[PDB]
Each structure stands twice: as C-alpha cells, then as structure tokens.
Nucleic acid binder design. Structure first.
Ligand SMILES: [Zn+2]
Length: 263
DNA sequence: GTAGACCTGGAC
DNA sequence: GTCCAGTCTAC
C-alpha cells in the first residue's frame, strides 16, 4: 500500500463511518497499539467519541474524532472493512471499533506489521510518526528544488532517496520503480550524479505517475496495474523497446528496470 | 549499504 | 523445503 492505494481507501471508507459514535474498542494483538502504550488506555479514551472526518498524510490514514485523532499505517498488508457486529469475524482480525448503531469497523493484517497512534488533534502533527514527514507530492510544496537540495548532498542510490519519507511522502516500491523508468534513470546510480535536467524530468514523471495512479484507483496485484512498465514484469519485453526487463536488489528491495531505456 | 526483525501464507 | 512480498535496529 502506497499513496494511491491509501487515498483510494480514504475516499471509499469516509461515507461508511462519518457520523457514527464509538461504543467499544476490542484488541486481539496488542503490539499494533503504539500510543498510548497501554492497550487498555487506548480503548477507554475513544469510547463516546464520534467520527467527524478522515484524512491522509503520506501513507498514513488520519481518523478525526471529537478531541482525538487516530493515526494508522497499514505497512504491508493492513486493510479496513465495515460490517454487522452480529456476524463472526474473518481470519486475522486484530482490532475492532464497535459503533452505537450496531455496525463495526474491522482491521485485518495477516503479517501483523501495522501501527496505530492516538493523540489530541492539536498534537498529532507535532509528534511522531507524522512530525518528520516530507511534503505531499501533489502539492506546490514539492518542487524540483526540494528534490535537488537533498540529492546534491548524498551519494546513496537514487532509489534509496525516493523511498525516504522525509524527502517526499508517499512513494513505495512500485511507484519508485515506475517513476525512474519513465524518467530514464537507473535505480542504482548515486543521487548526487544526477544532472539538473535529470532532476526536473524525474520530478515531472513522479507527479504524473502518482497522479495517474490515484485516478485509476491504485494498483491491484484499482486498474493501474494494466499501466505498469516494469514492476513485476521481469523476463517480459519492455513496452517501449522490446528489451527483456531485469530484476535485482537495490536499497534492500526487489528492483525492476529496462537496461536500454534507463541510464 | 546490508543481513536480521517483526510474521504469515502462497508459488515452485 | 526454499524464496518472495514498510520500517527499525545493529555491526
Ligand atoms: Zn526499454
């Protein structure tokens, strides 16, 4: 789950929960709760509060209640669904919010990597994990200049730079690989080796790629999966030149690229 | 930069 | 049986 997928969840989930009041909060895997550390305090404070809105910051979902804000990160497999509280739960359900109208919001996560933090609204943006996030890619706050200031000071791979949420917030393995192919830049090259022209081109493709993915409802692996040039296509012909797509390891992640179209 | 952690189930 | 799928620590 990257920005496009999280933004899709935010849009579809909002009307299904806005205006409902919390009656109970049940937790089956405590490690997911990060703040307050004590699961009992986490549950108690939300009882009686009403859902007023749902926003997104980077790859995080921000549930807006009365006094508090619930900050949730899905990591690799987290997912949400709304259903009747009278039916048996599905496998791997670790947290459930029960509403006064008999419906409930369920959180499932097979690998158990997800996290949840609760803070008073006016403290959320000034505390971890939101405090140190970079700017939103689809906002004027993200420009070629911002990307250069960070790139010109480090020799780490350009892919490692784009995956750093403090540089820009929202890109993950799929959209970093896709943006670099569109820009014609190899993922393993030093960020400082990029020319001014290459930085402007990369910025342009990053905004175009992420924006297009949001419109298509994200990648299901949504319909953006039908528009991928390299992710998951190792061994198949490049859609632009016909050369076989390759896969290696960069910045500790599986990496896909075309040896002819990219640097 | 690069294995090891946190964790579980599918593909070969 | 062995390999593969967002972020933190540790040498
Ligand atoms: Zn190509």
């Amino acid at each position: 789950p990257e920005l496009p997928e999280v933004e899709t969840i935010r849009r579809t989930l909002l009307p299904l929960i806005v205006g409902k009041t919390i009656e109970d909060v049940r937790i089956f895997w405590p490690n997911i709760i990060r703040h307050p550390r004590d699961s009992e305090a986490f549950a108690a404070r939300m009882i009686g509060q009403t859902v007023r809105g749902l926003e997104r910051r980077g790859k995080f979902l921000k549930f807006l209640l009365d006094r508090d804000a619930l900050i949730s990160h899905l990591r690799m497999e987290g997912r949400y669904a709304v259903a009747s509280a009278l039916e048996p739960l599905e496998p791997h359900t670790h947290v459930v919010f029960c509403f006064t109208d008999g419906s409930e919001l369920r959180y499932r996560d097979v690998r158990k990597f997800g996290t949840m933090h609760v803070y008073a609204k006016e403290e959320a943006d000034r505390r971890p994990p939101l405090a140190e996030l970079g700017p939103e890619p689809l906002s004027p706050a993200f420009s070629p200049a911002v990307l250069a200031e960070r790139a010109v000071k480090t020799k780490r791979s350009v892919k490692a730079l784009l995956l750093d949420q403090t540089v820009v917030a929202g890109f993950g393995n799929i959209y970093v690989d896709e943006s670099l192919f569109r820009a014609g830049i190899l993922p393993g090259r030093p960020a400082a080796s990029l020319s001014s022209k290459e930085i402007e081109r990369l910025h342009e493709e990053m905004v175009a790629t992420i924006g297009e993915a949001v419109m298509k409802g994200g990648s299901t692996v949504g319909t953006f999966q039908h528009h991928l040039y390299v992710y998951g296509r190792q061994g198949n012909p490049c859609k632009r030149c016909g050369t076989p797509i390759e896969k290696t390891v960069v910045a500790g992640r599986g990496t896909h690229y075309c040896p002819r179209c990219q640097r």
